[PDB]
Amino acid sequence: HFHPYNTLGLATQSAMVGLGAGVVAAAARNSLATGPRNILTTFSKSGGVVTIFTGASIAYVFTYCSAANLRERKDGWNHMWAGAATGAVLGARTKLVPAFIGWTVLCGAACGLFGWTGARFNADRKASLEQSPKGFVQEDAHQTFWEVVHRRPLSLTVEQLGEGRGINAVPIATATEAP
Amino acid sequence: LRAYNEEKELALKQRLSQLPPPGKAFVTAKEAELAELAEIAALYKTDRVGILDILLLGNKHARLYRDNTALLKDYYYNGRRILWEIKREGAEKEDWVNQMYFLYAPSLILLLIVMVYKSREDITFWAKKELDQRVLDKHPEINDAPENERDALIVERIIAGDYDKLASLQKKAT
Amino acid sequence: MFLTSILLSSLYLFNRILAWQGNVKHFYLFASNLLLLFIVVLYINFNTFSNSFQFNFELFNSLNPFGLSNSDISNGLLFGIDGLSLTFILLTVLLIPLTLLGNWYNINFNSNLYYTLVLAIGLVILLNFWALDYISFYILFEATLPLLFILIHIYGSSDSERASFYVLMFTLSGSLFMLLSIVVISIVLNTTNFINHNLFVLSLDLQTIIWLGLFIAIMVKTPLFPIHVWLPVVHSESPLAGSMILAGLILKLALYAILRLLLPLLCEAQILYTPMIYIISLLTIILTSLATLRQIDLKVIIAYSSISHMGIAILGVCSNTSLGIYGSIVLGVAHGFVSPALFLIVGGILYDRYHIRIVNYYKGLTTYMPQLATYIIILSFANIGTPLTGNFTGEFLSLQGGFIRNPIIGGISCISVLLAAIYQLKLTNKLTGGISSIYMHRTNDVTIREKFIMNILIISTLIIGICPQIMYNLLYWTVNNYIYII
Amino acid sequence: ALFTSLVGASGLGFATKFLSNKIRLKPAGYYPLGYVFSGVAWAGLGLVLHNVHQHSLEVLEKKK
Amino acid sequence: IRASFDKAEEPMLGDYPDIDPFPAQLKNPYKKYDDQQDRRNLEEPLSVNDDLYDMWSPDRFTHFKNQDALKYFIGFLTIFFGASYVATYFVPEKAAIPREFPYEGLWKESGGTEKSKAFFGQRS
Amino acid sequence: EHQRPELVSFDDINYNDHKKVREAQESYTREQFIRLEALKTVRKALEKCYEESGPNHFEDCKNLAEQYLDMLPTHRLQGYLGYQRNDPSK
Amino acid sequence: DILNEEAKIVQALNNQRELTIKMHELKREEKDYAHSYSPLFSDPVPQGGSIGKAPGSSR
């Protein structure tokens, strides 16, 4: 089915990557600047970039792996919880409570909308319309995604929708027949 | 239809050039200056041209016209607000009442009349007649009854049998 | 040659009426009144006994780009009606001269511009109900918005700018995701069509995605609670005809679009989601009608009233019942009658005279204007759900259909009869009674043109109120069409 | 039809000449002969596009 | 200022006078105002949440404190239902039998079937 | 003139021609209206039974009342979409 | 007379639907070297660079 994650291993890999991105962005901030700057103002007038990269990396991957491990499935919700943790780390830099709540909620919603579309910038090859079976079914078969039919099985309607509202396993007519 | 005169209309504009603006011509809170303007208000009220002239003639005449009617229009309504001017009667036709009482209102009454009589052809009248027809088709012997009995006899069959055929359309269920 | 000679004659007659009369407004009234005559003659030749689309015509086909096309292969833009379309067209076309009437003396500066924009918006929402492709529905669904932007921006209150922006912004932003969903339909089926589209079945996981993109656009246009946000300001800072055409016709256009576009091919989706629609419908009836009580401005109250009535309307549509569908249609048509009369009462008789819309100035309008106060009360009571008016027929059959599908949602949906009365009569007794206001100097009684508009918009509620069967001859197909009870 | 395409493309030409008169702050019928000129030019573009579409359909018929 | 929601509106207002909310009814009626019916002078600053302090506002009784009146109302409520519920115990029995019915309790008469005699039936 | 169009069904027809699908659609629709007029006829007869009977309507037309309350859940407009989108026994 | 004019339009739209599905299949179909490169010189085989050429270099 699935495979659980190594939260400590993926977290320390991301911590090293965020440390590296912080050093690169601090050097790019020195060299693209004005005023008296030296070799030691890399981490002095840094603007706190290495804290941004480090905290965002560790929080997103730790909350993503922990939420994927306690739910025992991988879907778009884990990106929502991880993006909420990222928004918590980015929103604590502005030391205000309603700001913080806004950063958490909106960053979590944006990352959940990201992770629900596949969590990929690029395309998936087998899932797109162009590389998948489309059009009508040629004979009767299990109608896969992207396919059209004329008539659907009623057993599927009872299994997917329910046995309730106006919906029945037998139409209301021949359930009421004279013999 | 009717016709206008060019020279009268040029003389109208020559009259209008020596006249004050509409924002001055009545703001004096009589008949030395206020008696030439009510003439001009009747000149607005009278209609200079019909349909045969507007199609066939050029645009210089039409521009001269439109300037004349705009100035006469201001001299009519400003004098009606401050103070033919010095009357007070009831009979009058606003510009819209020609084609709202005589075209909008009768077409709306025509929409009412066609909705009311088009409601005769409804599914419920037709379905009642059809169900009576099916009962008369299966059991024709109630034809032989007199007038008052037959309807009642039809009801005794409507209760005694469904007469739908809706289980026959759903032949894929059984 | 004949139909081209008609146009070459009529454009010439137009140019001549321009050269001789400075306004056009006579010719615009004449044209829209002729459109009435034409559509009712189409109603006479309409066959009610056929479910079919009777008067079909293709535009912009390959083999004939300019005009009608009779070919074995069709890729243009289809157009045609059933009963369900035609009802709204009737409600459309009798509204169009009245707004052209409604500003007959208000607009002074640039007449021909304003009346051209108002008639052009009315023609676009005529052709909205004729359309038969998904794309040809959508091209004209959004043709309105430049005309609405230019109309709200140039003319209005002091706050014309922000209101014209919001009518572009929210309406656009919902309509884009609508386009996303239309594209996803048009690449699976390879056919946008209002005829065949109940035949095709999509996967439940694929209906699950498509339906969100259409439904959030209908959430924007029939303003349900998450985005009900542009509606009071685009009314409260509109001119008169823009507000009338908006709240009488655009909201009912999205009420039409939830029937025409969603209920045929999203059925198996639609059952899984009726509780979400009932959440949002009850939550936009309760919470918008409660926000009406704290209002300082006067056109804004009738705006939030329109929100509450459309919130009642859409839970008859998604009710999966004959009663609910018919009640939503009779609510939509009767609200399209009663509501522009209320925007006339706040905007025409009461903003043309005093030019300020704050409620606190207006008191005791009876003793100087008795027949206006007469109108204000009998249009108040027609709005609530007080019967023999057609608004109650819509509210009643909609609440009944909403009680079928889920009874507990109908129990709290039924208190809307109370909540819709509170703010409306709270406004009505403040306008009607008291010593006449020290701020308002006495002005003219209601003129003949305003009384004309009012008498028409009140008789047309009362006829539907006394007998709602007068338009069942159009809908008895389309009440049975959208029902999915296996 | 060939004829309606001609009349409508000439109508597009009348629209271009009208809008070009009216950017110039001229009257509508300022230079009336230019309506004929532009209408015949845009009608000729209609001729060309209609004939190209004829030939493309005739190529599609020959693939059977 | 005086009410709690008026204090809740305070951090929103900016360059607005923040005056004391006072009821337009509990103004005395005999002082001459511009509008006697509104009880309001021509240019008088309107309060934070005015329409609760309007003449068209609630009636706003002044003879009882509202918490006290809550107690008195619920007191009369509770004493009536408690007195009636306790007086259900001190009741006398009646002197007649509840009356009987022919044809086995008219069960055929009130619809009924021999298998449904218990649901549509009387005392016999 | 009381014309009677012919009944066709959803199952024998091809769904690729539109002439037969629309006829089956209108047919199933109109049959629901016929079935509904049978319901309304029994409601009219039950009202006449009650008004003639007076006090003994409990036993004069227990059967007509039970007939009406048994027909009411199953005799209404149901919709062609539910039968044409889904197939029983497949 | 209205059901037949339904069916004419639906036939004319299913014709366009099949026309599109065909013309979308015709794109992803692979194409010959004579159609998708130069028509003249239909071989991909080079024999390029023949002045000091060695026999046995052909394969």
Ligand SMILES: CCCCCCCCCCC(CCCCCCCCCC)(CO[C@H]1O[C@@H](CO)[C@H](O[C@@H]2O[C@@H](CO)[C@H](O)[C@@H](O)[C@@H]2O)[C@@H](O)[C@@H]1O)CO[C@H]1O[C@@H](CO)[C@H](O[C@@H]2O[C@@H](CO)[C@H](O)[C@@H](O)[C@@H]2O)[C@@H](O)[C@H]1O
């Ligand atoms: C309009 C409002 C905005 C709506 C935004 C749309 C985004 C919604 C996306 C939904 C959708 C695209 C459909 C969208 C088309 C309409 C687009 C509308 C406009 C687009 C703007 C992307 O579905 C995504 O869902 C994500 C989670 O929800 C998954 O995340 C990831 O999870 C991990 C898994 O490995 C990743 O490892 C991880 O990296 C991610 O965490 C992705 O796997 C998946 O691609 C669905 O696509 C997919 O659905 C499945 C069904 O199950 C289909 O399988 C079919 O069914 C089975 C037999 O029945 C058989 O398997 C198969 O034989 C058959 O093929 C696929 O065919 C496929 O196509």
Ligand SMILES: CCCCCCCCCCCCCCCCCC(=O)OC[C@H](COP(=O)(O)OCCN)OC(=O)CCCCCCCCCCCCCCCCC
């Ligand atoms: C700018 C937005 C983008 C625009 C995209 C859409 C462009 C629309 C352009 C307007 C032109 C459409 C209206 C005229 C076309 C219909 C004329 C016609 O002849 O209809 C033919 C139809 C059947 O005729 P036929 O099959 O030939 O048989 C006749 C037997 N007696 O006969 C009929 O069934 C009657 C048809 C009635 C049509 C009523 C339409 C109401 C609106 C009319 C004015 C539309 C102008 C709108 C201008 C604003 C642009 C949207």
Ligand SMILES: CCCCCCCCCCCCCCCCCC(=O)OC[C@H](COP(=O)(O)OCCN)OC(=O)CCCCCCCCCCCCCCCCC
């Ligand atoms: C078997 C069970 C038995 C149950 C019995 C117990 C039932 C108790 C529930 C009582 C509810 C009463 C109905 C509430 C709405 C009544 C509205 C109303 O009457 O407003 C009156 C008010 C004017 O009154 P006033 O100014 O005080 O005095 C005037 C005399 N000079 O008019 C105004 O000022 C207009 C503005 C205020 C309008 C009210 C706005 C808020 C409405 C809240 C409605 C709440 C509904 C749900 C109630 C839940 C109760 C549990």
